[PDB]
Design an enzyme around this catalytic site. Sequence first.
Site, PDB file in Angstrom:
ATOM      1  N   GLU A  57      36.843  -9.422  14.429  1.00 15.95           N
ATOM      2  CA  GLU A  57      35.686  -9.314  14.631  1.00 15.95           C
ATOM      3  C   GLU A  57      35.566  -8.447  15.813  1.00 15.95           C
ATOM      4  OE1 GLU A  57      33.897 -11.465  11.384  1.00 15.95           O
ATOM      5  OE2 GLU A  57      33.513  -9.829  12.572  1.00 15.95           O
TER       6      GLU A  57
ATOM      7  N   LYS B  97      29.239 -19.128   1.561  1.00 16.36           N
ATOM      8  CA  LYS B  97      29.526 -18.378   2.657  1.00 16.36           C
ATOM      9  C   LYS B  97      29.050 -16.823   2.292  1.00 16.36           C
ATOM     10  CE  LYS B  97      30.223 -17.498   6.712  1.00 16.36           C
ATOM     11  NZ  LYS B  97      29.399 -18.080   7.791  1.00 16.36           N
TER      12      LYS B  97
ATOM     13  N   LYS C 234      35.904 -15.491   6.259  1.00 11.01           N
ATOM     14  CA  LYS C 234      36.051 -16.926   7.104  1.00 11.01           C
ATOM     15  C   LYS C 234      36.585 -18.152   6.159  1.00 11.01           C
ATOM     16  CE  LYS C 234      33.426 -14.614  10.298  1.00 11.01           C
ATOM     17  NZ  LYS C 234      32.050 -14.614  11.260  1.00 11.01           N
TER      18      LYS C 234
ATOM     19  N   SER D 243      31.786 -11.497   6.914  1.00 10.71           N
ATOM     20  CA  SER D 243      31.929 -12.932   7.072  1.00 10.71           C
ATOM     21  C   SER D 243      32.527 -13.607   5.962  1.00 10.71           C
ATOM     22  CB  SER D 243      30.780 -13.725   7.664  1.00 10.71           C
ATOM     23  OG  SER D 243      30.663 -13.060   8.976  1.00 10.71           O
TER      24      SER D 243
ATOM     25  N   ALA E 233      27.295  -9.978   6.183  1.00  9.96           N
ATOM     26  CA  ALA E 233      26.416  -8.980   6.393  1.00  9.96           C
ATOM     27  C   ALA E 233      27.393  -7.975   7.246  1.00  9.96           C
ATOM     28  CB  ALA E 233      25.228  -9.221   7.051  1.00  9.96           C
TER      29      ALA E 233
ATOM     30  N   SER F  61      28.704 -18.298  11.178  1.00 17.92           N
ATOM     31  CA  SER F  61      29.373 -17.163  11.250  1.00 17.92           C
ATOM     32  C   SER F  61      29.705 -16.801  12.565  1.00 17.92           C
ATOM     33  CB  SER F  61      28.305 -15.862  10.516  1.00 17.92           C
ATOM     34  OG  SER F  61      28.723 -15.640   9.280  1.00 17.92           O
TER      35      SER F  61
END
EC number: 3.5.2.6
Lengths: 263, 165
Positions: free
Chosen positions: A141, A209, A48, A45, A212, A105
């Site tokens: 994603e 930010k 992003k 993440s 995982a 996220s």
Amino acid sequence: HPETLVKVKDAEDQLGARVGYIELDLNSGKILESFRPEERFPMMSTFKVLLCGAVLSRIDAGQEQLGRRIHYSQNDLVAASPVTEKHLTDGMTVRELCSAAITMSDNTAANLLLTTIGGPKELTAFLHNMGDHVTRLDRWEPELNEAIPNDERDTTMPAAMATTLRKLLTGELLTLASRQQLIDWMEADKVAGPLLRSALPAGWFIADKSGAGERGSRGIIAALGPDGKPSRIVVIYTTGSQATMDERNRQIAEIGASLIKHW
Amino acid sequence: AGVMTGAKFTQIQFGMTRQQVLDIAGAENCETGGSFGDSIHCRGHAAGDYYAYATFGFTSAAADAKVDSKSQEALLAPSAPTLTLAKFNQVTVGMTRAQVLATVGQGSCTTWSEYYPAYPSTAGVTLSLSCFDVDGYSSTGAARGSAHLWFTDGVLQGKRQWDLV
Ligand SMILES: [Ca+2]
């Protein structure tokens, strides 16, 4: 300070996996400390932030609007999307999507944002054109979190990520307003409490930010500093560990406590 | 009463008040406003970069509004996950929920979201199912071999899968 490196190596032993680390001076862009600065780690993440940076860039160029409403549907929904799932009926604006993706996220928000910029390929093109010839996004994603050993798809190097974050938050790449917007979303981060924030002293500033992924991948990028002002960038990544999430959060938290202790 | 759980999600019923939801879920686990508007969002145990969670939508912002939407991720576990790519490919738009379940396995799915846009009327009900293969479901991690099947008035409108074999 050397003590922080002792902690980083400790982490590699405690987690049984490699840790990538970078402490960069925000003003000079000089590396204050590093460990495996040029080894690849899955961004998870943390990408992003680069994603919304690319969005803000298009907004600067007047090719995108913060208030533009995106009307998505069931087909666009992917796992771990608490905000976008809730607004499925009325849609969300580009602004709301970046807020969801960075502060929460939200995976669907990230995919929707990726679509607005042309996809992973265009994000990588954006990065390559700003001087980052290492960081790359290849998938959407949730597949980009696979973390397959030696797979370079969707990875970055600690040093590249730190320098890129610096260019986005202080460079001339984005307008002042946009730099402020990006760092503001990061400062409002709501899902990284167990990491650096857990060691942040009262009055300090931190915009971050976290991420995982599969195979123990974990990481965080941040701009922090004392007295309500960021003065350094920190990047920490790890992948391959079999330790528990809490153990991984702990190790990252301890590295932060160390770098703050010896600030 | 601990964090948000599948049992709490199941105990909460459509038609309930905000206070009934909070008392069942445990106020400490819930939030409202901001990113979630009038809905009540309740967190469960940590999972990945977020948590297992439930989101309850209400008919209005009033304190006496009623639950007209129930959504959850990682709170409910499939009873007997047997979904496969082969079975997924056999599912077809137009199928009733019964037909879909006969195709993917009676215990392969959990309810992701259930919404009644005309509450108290059940007309126009939309429902999303999260289905997983033998090892697709993960409460603390990320789904590995799963699918999303959505319906309107009990009829399948679409489907999508990730990593099924
Ligand atoms: Ca699988």
